[PDB]
User: Which sequence fits this backbone?
């Protein structure tokens, strides 16, 4: 009824998360232009 | 405060405006706002009159250029400075008003008229976009070409949700300074695929590739808002009211008289009005004779509708609304509405001069800015081509002294006289009192003292040769 | 050796599509004209028409 009831706080307490892997190991970005993606390597071993 | 909270017992209790930045307040419906504004200015007589007044008063028939180099700052002798000034003025007078129309790429404009185009575009869309190009054609001495592009040509590609840096087609730095634009091709016909292109604001060498001119109300306002925004609905409803009122007057006047007989329609018309005489549905055409008085029996009555006064307050109400729209647009009500009735000389002068002050301010803050930008862009090409030799004792080069060398303003149509005699009396009295200068009065009259003196000398020597009469400037 | 953006690929695809659309429209009118001044009688009909 007579319930004017002004609010004063809208606390979230929603989540706790931060990647930090985006800066730890994968600093560089490379969006594709094509679809096929090729990556390779070179092994070093000799008698 | 008391009115700040809710109002005098509720009132505006349910009205809580959404406090937000200018970009948040304009970007979400910027396209439709511009569309409504251009539609109103395109199909409304009053708005067309307003924009015409803008483009005719801000600049007018002529846009004279006057350059004063910063010789004091640059450590340059005044005689060399003014020699360079007259050289560049001659170059400008042979370039800008060239009948080639080759200053602009489309070859369909001249300098003054494209200045008018720009100021009108800013007035009715809130912003101005110009670009500079270096033509590959070697036929012309000057390879610079210009083109104004509508804001609708600049938009966020794919119309996606706006990003922090790319802001509906403009790239802003960390500090928010604009550096690049997204401009798409012409959209007529729009059924062909539409392609965008990124354009830097300026060349990395310092040349101004693109020019954005607008009045930012608040910081961070990347796109200007047209002045119509505050009055669009209140003029649209006005014109709808005018149309409906005209239609109502037509329908009220088109009936006039009625007949209440019992017989069939054709017989009643024959016996009370005339008509008939058919040679061989379409009701019946009544002969337009003169002073016809019919005879009636019981059950018959001819009733001529008294209709109604057709302007029961409509004229004064639309007058008040026109006052409102004139206040909104910043122009004088008399100019907007062709209403000079019962106006005193003093009051008409007051309104005219306050409107003139507004127009001069807008001129200085829009046309002068864009003219300076394009003038500096052309001047860079001029000095590179070395058509005019910059003085050899420059303490700073043109690259850093762009503002120093490009120190120049413009004179549009002057303060046109309301009486003429009063103004010329003021001019002559101020001159004989030493309170003003030939430059000031010739600028007020739309002239320039240098070539006016040259013309005076030429006429004087012509009269001397002719042996007719020495004019009022001798020895 | 010289690829292109799939956006440009779509652009040229649409251009070719419009071209063949125009050709298909034009041949209809040409068939109309040849039937018309070949025999005078000329009827148009087809599925769902």
Assistant:
């Amino acid at each position: 009824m007579y319930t004017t009831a002004q609010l004063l706080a809208a606390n979230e307490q929603k989540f706790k998360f931060d990647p930090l892997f985006l800066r730890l190991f994968f600093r560089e970005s490379y969006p594709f232009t094509t679809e096929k993606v090729y990556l390779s390597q070179i092994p070093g071993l000799v008698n | 405060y008391h009115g700040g909270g809710s109002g005098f017992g509720g009132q505006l209790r349910s009205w809580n405006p959404p406090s937000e930045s200018v970009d948040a307040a304009l970007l979400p419906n910027f396209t439709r706002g511009n569309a409504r504004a251009d539609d109103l200015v395109r199909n409304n007589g009053y708005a067309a009159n307003a924009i015409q007044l803008h483009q005719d008063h801000i600049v007018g028939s002529f846009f004279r250029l006057s350059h004063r180099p910063s010789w004091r700052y640059l450590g340059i002798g005044e005689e060399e400075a003014r020699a360079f000034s007259r050289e560049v003025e001659a170059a400008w007078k042979e370039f800008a008003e060239d009948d080639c129309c080759c200053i602009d790429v489309e070859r369909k404009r001249t300098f003054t008229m494209m200045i008018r185009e720009g100021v009108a575009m800013h007035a009715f869309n809130g912003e101005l976009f110009v670009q500079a190009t270096w033509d590959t054609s070697s036929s012309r001495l000057f390879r610079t070409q210009f083109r104004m592009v509508s804001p609708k040509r600049i938009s966020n590609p794919n119309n996606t949700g706006d990003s922090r840096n790319c802001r509906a087609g403009v790239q802003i730095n960390d500090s928010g300074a604009a550096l690049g634009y997204y401009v798409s091709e012409d959209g007529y016909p729009g059924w062909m695929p539409q392609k965008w292109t990124w354009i830097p604001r300026e060349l990395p060498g310092g040349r101004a590739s693109f020019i954005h001119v607008f009045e930012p109300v608040e910081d961070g306002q990347t796109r200007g808002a047209n002045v119509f925004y505050s009055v669009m609905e209140q003029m649209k409803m006005l014109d709808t009211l005018q149309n409906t009122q005209l239609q109502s007057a037509i329908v009220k006047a088109m009936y006039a008289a009625t007949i209440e007989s019992e017989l069939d329609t054709q017989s009643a018309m024959d016996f009370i009005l005339g008509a008939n005489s058919q040679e061989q549905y379409a009701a019946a055409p009544v002969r337009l004779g003169g002073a016809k008085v019919p005879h009636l029996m019981p059950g018959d009555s001819l009733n001529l509708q008294t209709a109604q006064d057709t302007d029961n307050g409509y004229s004064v109400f639309e007058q008040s609304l026109l006052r409102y729209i004139a206040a909104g647009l910043g122009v004088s009500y008399e100019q907007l509405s062709r209403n000079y009735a019962q106006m005193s000389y003093s009051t008409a002068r007051a309104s005219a001069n306050e409107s003139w002050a507004y127009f001069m301010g807008r001129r200085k803050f829009v046309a002068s800015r864009q003219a300076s930008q394009m003038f500096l862009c052309w001047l860079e090409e001029a000095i590179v081509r070395r058509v005019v030799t910059l003085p050899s004792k420059a303490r700073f080069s043109f690259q850093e002294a762009r503002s120093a060398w490009g120190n120049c303003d413009w004179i549009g149509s002057g303060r046109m006289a309301i009486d003429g005699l009063k103004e010329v009396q003021e001019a002559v009295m101020l001159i004989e009192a030493g309170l003003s200068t030939y430059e000031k009065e010739c600028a007020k009259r739309g002239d320039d003292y240098q070539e006016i003196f040259a013309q005076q000398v030429r006429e004087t020597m012509e009269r001397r040769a002719a042996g007719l009469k020495p004019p009022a400037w001798a020895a | 050796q010289n690829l292109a953006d799939p956006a440009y690929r779509r652009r040229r695809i649409i251009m070719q599509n419009m071209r063949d659309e125009e050709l298909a429209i034009a041949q209809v009118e040409e068939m109309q004209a040849v039937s018309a001044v070949l025999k005078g009688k000329y009827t148009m009909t087809g599925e769902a028409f």
About this structure: The radius of gyration of chain C is 18 Å. The longest helix of chain C spans residues 6-39.
